[PDB]
Write an enzyme that holds these catalytic residues in place. Structure first.
Site, PDB file in Angstrom:
ATOM      1  N   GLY A   9       0.841  -1.180   0.000  1.00 28.16           N
ATOM      2  CA  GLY A   9       0.000   0.000   0.000  1.00 28.16           C
ATOM      3  C   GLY A   9       0.878   1.231   0.000  1.00 28.16           C
ATOM      4  O   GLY A   9       1.952   1.232   0.607  1.00 28.16           O
ATOM      5  N   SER A  10       0.468   2.279  -0.701  1.00 24.78           N
ATOM      6  CA  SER A  10       1.283   3.485  -0.716  1.00 24.78           C
ATOM      7  C   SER A  10       0.421   4.722  -0.840  1.00 24.78           C
ATOM      8  O   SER A  10       0.812   5.689  -1.502  1.00 24.78           O
ATOM      9  CB  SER A  10       2.285   3.427  -1.861  1.00 24.78           C
ATOM     10  OG  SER A  10       1.612   3.350  -3.105  1.00 24.78           O
ATOM     11  N   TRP A  13      -2.232   6.810   4.076  1.00 30.26           N
ATOM     12  CA  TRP A  13      -1.833   6.146   5.306  1.00 30.26           C
ATOM     13  C   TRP A  13      -0.558   5.343   5.100  1.00 30.26           C
ATOM     14  O   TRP A  13       0.350   5.375   5.936  1.00 30.26           O
ATOM     15  CB  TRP A  13      -3.008   5.276   5.744  1.00 30.26           C
ATOM     16  CG  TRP A  13      -3.096   4.753   7.121  1.00 30.26           C
ATOM     17  CD1 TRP A  13      -3.785   3.646   7.486  1.00 30.26           C
ATOM     18  CD2 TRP A  13      -2.518   5.284   8.332  1.00 30.26           C
ATOM     19  NE1 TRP A  13      -3.663   3.426   8.840  1.00 30.26           N
ATOM     20  CE2 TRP A  13      -2.895   4.419   9.384  1.00 30.26           C
ATOM     21  CE3 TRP A  13      -1.713   6.391   8.626  1.00 30.26           C
ATOM     22  CZ2 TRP A  13      -2.521   4.635  10.714  1.00 30.26           C
ATOM     23  CZ3 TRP A  13      -1.324   6.601   9.956  1.00 30.26           C
ATOM     24  CH2 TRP A  13      -1.732   5.727  10.980  1.00 30.26           C
ATOM     25  N   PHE A  40       1.386   0.627  -6.380  1.00 33.23           N
ATOM     26  CA  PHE A  40       0.600   0.542  -7.604  1.00 33.23           C
ATOM     27  C   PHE A  40       1.028   1.648  -8.550  1.00 33.23           C
ATOM     28  O   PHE A  40       0.914   2.833  -8.226  1.00 33.23           O
ATOM     29  CB  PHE A  40      -0.884   0.669  -7.235  1.00 33.23           C
ATOM     30  CG  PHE A  40      -1.837   0.567  -8.403  1.00 33.23           C
ATOM     31  CD1 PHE A  40      -2.329  -0.672  -8.816  1.00 33.23           C
ATOM     32  CD2 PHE A  40      -2.262   1.702  -9.061  1.00 33.23           C
ATOM     33  CE1 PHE A  40      -3.212  -0.767  -9.894  1.00 33.23           C
ATOM     34  CE2 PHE A  40      -3.130   1.613 -10.133  1.00 33.23           C
ATOM     35  CZ  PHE A  40      -3.609   0.377 -10.547  1.00 33.23           C
ATOM     36  N   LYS A 196     -18.120   1.769  15.560  1.00 34.98           N
ATOM     37  CA  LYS A 196     -18.070   3.147  16.027  1.00 34.98           C
ATOM     38  C   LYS A 196     -18.831   4.077  15.092  1.00 34.98           C
ATOM     39  O   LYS A 196     -19.438   5.054  15.545  1.00 34.98           O
ATOM     40  CB  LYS A 196     -16.603   3.608  16.173  1.00 34.98           C
ATOM     41  CG  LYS A 196     -16.002   4.112  14.885  1.00 34.98           C
ATOM     42  CD  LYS A 196     -14.546   4.439  14.972  1.00 34.98           C
ATOM     43  CE  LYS A 196     -13.995   4.671  13.579  1.00 34.98           C
ATOM     44  NZ  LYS A 196     -14.378   5.950  13.031  1.00 34.98           N
ATOM     45  N   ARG A 261     -17.248  12.844   9.986  1.00 39.41           N
ATOM     46  CA  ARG A 261     -18.087  13.181   8.844  1.00 39.41           C
ATOM     47  C   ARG A 261     -19.455  12.511   8.933  1.00 39.41           C
ATOM     48  O   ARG A 261     -20.467  13.123   8.581  1.00 39.41           O
ATOM     49  CB  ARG A 261     -17.390  12.774   7.542  1.00 39.41           C
ATOM     50  N   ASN A 262     -19.498  11.239   9.352  1.00 30.30           N
ATOM     51  CA  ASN A 262     -20.771  10.574   9.633  1.00 30.30           C
ATOM     52  C   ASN A 262     -21.647  11.426  10.551  1.00 30.30           C
ATOM     53  O   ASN A 262     -22.863  11.527  10.349  1.00 30.30           O
ATOM     54  CB  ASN A 262     -20.529   9.201  10.280  1.00 30.30           C
ATOM     55  CG  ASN A 262     -20.240   8.107   9.274  1.00 30.30           C
ATOM     56  OD1 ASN A 262     -21.093   7.248   9.010  1.00 30.30           O
ATOM     57  ND2 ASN A 262     -19.021   8.104   8.732  1.00 30.30           N
ATOM     58  N   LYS A 287     -19.825   7.731   0.136  1.00 33.79           N
ATOM     59  CA  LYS A 287     -20.936   7.229   0.931  1.00 33.79           C
ATOM     60  C   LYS A 287     -20.552   7.058   2.410  1.00 33.79           C
ATOM     61  O   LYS A 287     -19.379   6.943   2.778  1.00 33.79           O
ATOM     62  CB  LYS A 287     -21.422   5.900   0.357  1.00 33.79           C
ATOM     63  N   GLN A 289     -20.309   5.244   6.055  1.00 41.07           N
ATOM     64  CA  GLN A 289     -19.996   3.904   6.546  1.00 41.07           C
ATOM     65  C   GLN A 289     -21.048   3.407   7.531  1.00 41.07           C
ATOM     66  O   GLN A 289     -21.479   2.249   7.463  1.00 41.07           O
ATOM     67  CB  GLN A 289     -18.621   3.916   7.222  1.00 41.07           C
ATOM     68  CG  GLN A 289     -17.462   4.185   6.277  1.00 41.07           C
ATOM     69  CD  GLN A 289     -16.570   2.981   6.101  1.00 41.07           C
ATOM     70  OE1 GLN A 289     -16.283   2.569   4.980  1.00 41.07           O
ATOM     71  NE2 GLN A 289     -16.117   2.414   7.211  1.00 41.07           N
TER      72      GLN A 289
END
Ligand SMILES: NC(=O)c1ccc[n+]([C@@H]2O[C@H](COP(=O)([O-])OP(=O)(O)OC[C@H]3O[C@@H](n4cnc5c(N)ncnc54)[C@H](O)[C@@H]3O)[C@@H](O)[C@H]2O)c1
Ligand SMILES: NC(=O)c1ccc[n+]([C@@H]2O[C@H](COP(=O)([O-])OP(=O)(O)OC[C@H]3O[C@@H](n4cnc5c(N)ncnc54)[C@H](O)[C@@H]3O)[C@@H](O)[C@H]2O)c1
Ligand SMILES: [K+]
Ligand SMILES: [K+]
Lengths: 340, 338
Positions: A9-10, A13, A40, A196, A261-262, A287, A289
């Site tokens: 992953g890059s 985070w 990637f 959460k 944000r939720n 959208k 979560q």
């Protein structure tokens, strides 16, 4: 036999985690200084991102302005990145982890271990551990990449069953401004991250209905109790109430219910009458979560007849999906199981 | 047979508690509808007169009617002497003299519950002077909101099961939900310790730190509350008790919206002394800083000052001139991450 690290992953985070991991892997003798990071490949101005990372030591796309330790090597082929690695750090959006695991299967060191930072309700860490056959740990807490890249003080929890592997992941990721507590409950650490967000929608409903901090505190606490009880009923691993006092529980819950944000969307929804869909777009279009997780919780609970045991979680579902007036949300907590 | 209640105190919280207790005592068969309420006499007319005639504590619970079955009584022995259940709800500075007056004058087998929030536990001061078993009521609540029937919860700590259930029935409403737990000391110590954590939380706000840093400070404060209680308190002490309203909920409400927080922030953000900000904004004394100083004495006696860096950071910034801008450095080698 110093341990080799690969960061799978890059993104935002991954890159921020690379700043820490590179530094710790250079300094500490138990780690090999060469840290690979699967990147990637992408074209940035007719140039290769892996090339920019290996020449400027900056992820100009996902973490601009920050320098990565130069011992962190971008590698565009995920097999090449991970194949000699003792420790894999999975840090990609949830939608890509499947394909990545399908390219890595059969290709890892026999002794390889994994830690997931990825935050029908099956734990993403299990998806990885099962497809690849490696012990999996998790890394979860009240934290965000920008702040960790800026060395702003925060904590995280690591869930890891084996003590020696836990101690090693701590060494690899701990700094004076990124403080780590290791606990042995992988499932518990990990499930908090999805639950959460259901609570934070309720927290936002509370705000939007005009209630104060003492009411909101009650909503959050009952949410927490519902998180604990649900985790004890759903998770395979062992599950203790005391694990929810870690950063992954109470801290992530409170930072989300007060500044998430939720919560903002939930509040606006209760004050305005506009749908969840419209508010996601007006406030980029990604959208929410919480609501989808609540639906998934309803299916699990409805299939075991326990919808009644979880009025907060279920009230979130019914307001978001079954037209229950958001103004009933508080009524739904006036006969809660905690108070029976 | 029918249990009689006396509310010792008639202020903001006592008057709101009268609304609930008066309502519930009238309604439920197992309580005597006659609820006495000790009212320190004042010239508003005679305050006790105003209440008993107009059924409104105009000065303390303004804009509310009290139930008519709640009887103001100006002498505390008369209010209490027939009571089976005594509800202690006065500011800390007065409970001593009131107990001195009640000592020896109470009904056989009388019981009490303290709502007094704010080291020796107040419930122990009361129970020792009067020789009655004591319970406590503590949580994320304020009288105004409770008078307005706005939803919140509280914790009762009560060692005796049948007595806890009786207190739950007396005080629970649809918008005031109660959980009974058996750990009195643990419930009660939260109320003092939470204000220290709030001072630290306030420092975060005033220094401009983000929500994730502040959450870390609050969480570490909570771990310090738990560890201090396990170290300090008589009776059993459970981590999970701090998941009740008296613990985590009172802690977050105070850390995201209290007076200790507002002053702490202004001090970090403006540089103005706590004395100065006490005088201006309150010259009432902030509770957090003084508790911190008491904690420092206790921890010295036990050789543990190093084990509570959050509590001792509040203390050193408030009293030993440690710069508030370095508060966070004291949390970078916390016992929790060792
Ligand atoms: N950003 C934060 O502050 C933060 C904080 C805590 C947890 N997390 C979690 O970390 C995980 C990743 O978050 P992020 O912000 O780093 O995501 P991101 O969008 O910043 O990551 C981009 C990365 O995702 C991969 N990717 C993108 N497109 C791909 C494709 N077509 N095929 C295969 N792989 C592709 C690549 O590795 C790419 O580098 C998430 O689960 C997130 O919840 C993020
Ligand atoms: N106000 C709230 O919302 C709230 C909420 C939870 C807990 N509490 C706690 O309850 C306790 C009482 O708080 P309060 O807000 O009702 O205080 P208050 O200041 O409104 O109490 C007034 C009462 O104090 C007593 N009193 C005043 N002067 C006196 C004197 N010279 N001599 C003897 N008695 C005198 C009298 O009983 C008077 O009625 C405190 O510990 C408080 O922390 C208050
Ligand atoms: K090294
Ligand atoms: K009655």
């Amino acid at each position: 036999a110093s341990k080799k690290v690969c960061i799978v992953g890059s993104g935002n985070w991954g890159s921020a985690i690379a700043k820490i991991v590179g530094g710790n892997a250079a300094q500490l003798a138990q780690f090999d200084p060469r840290v690979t990071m699967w990147v990637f490949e992408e074209d940035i101005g007719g140039k290769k991102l892996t090339e920019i990372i290996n020449t400027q030591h900056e992820n100009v796309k996902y973490l601009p302005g920050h320098k990565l330790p130069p011992n962190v090597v971008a590698v565009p082929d995920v097999v090449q990145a991970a194949e000699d690695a003792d420790i894999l750090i999975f840090v990609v959006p949830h939608q890509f982890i499947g394909k990545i695991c399908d390219q890595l299967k059969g290709h890892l060191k026999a002794n390889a271990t994994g830690i997931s930072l990825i935050k029908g309700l099956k734990l993403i860490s299990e998806v990885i551990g099962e497809r690849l056959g490696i012990p999996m740990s998790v890394l979860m807490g009240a934290n965000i990449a920008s702040e960790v890249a800026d060395e702003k003080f925060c904590e995280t929890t690591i869930g890891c069953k084996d003590p020696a592997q836990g101690q090693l992941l701590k060494e690899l990721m701990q700094t004076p401004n990124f403080r780590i507590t290791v606990v042995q409950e992988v499932d518990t650490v990990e499930i908090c991250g999805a639950l959460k967000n259901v609570v934070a929608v309720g927290a936002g409903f509370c705000d939007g209905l005009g209630f104060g901090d003492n009411t909101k505190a009650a909503v959050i606490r009952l949410g927490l109790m519902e998180m604990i009880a649900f985790a004890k009923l759903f998770c395979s691993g062992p599950v203790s109430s005391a694990t929810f006092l870690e950063s992954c529980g109470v801290a992530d819950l409170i930072t989300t219910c007060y500044g998430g944000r939720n919560r903002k969307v939930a509040e606006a929804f209760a004050r305005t009458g506009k749908s969840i869909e419209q508010l996601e777009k007006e406030l980029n279009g990604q959208k929410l979560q919480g609501p989808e997780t609540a639906r998934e919780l309803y299916s699990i609970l409805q299939h075991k007849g326990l919808v009644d045991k979880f009025p907060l979680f279920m009230a979130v579902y019914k307001v978001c999906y079954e037209g229950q007036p958001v103004g009933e949300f508080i009524h739904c907590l006036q006969n809660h199981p905690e108070h029976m």
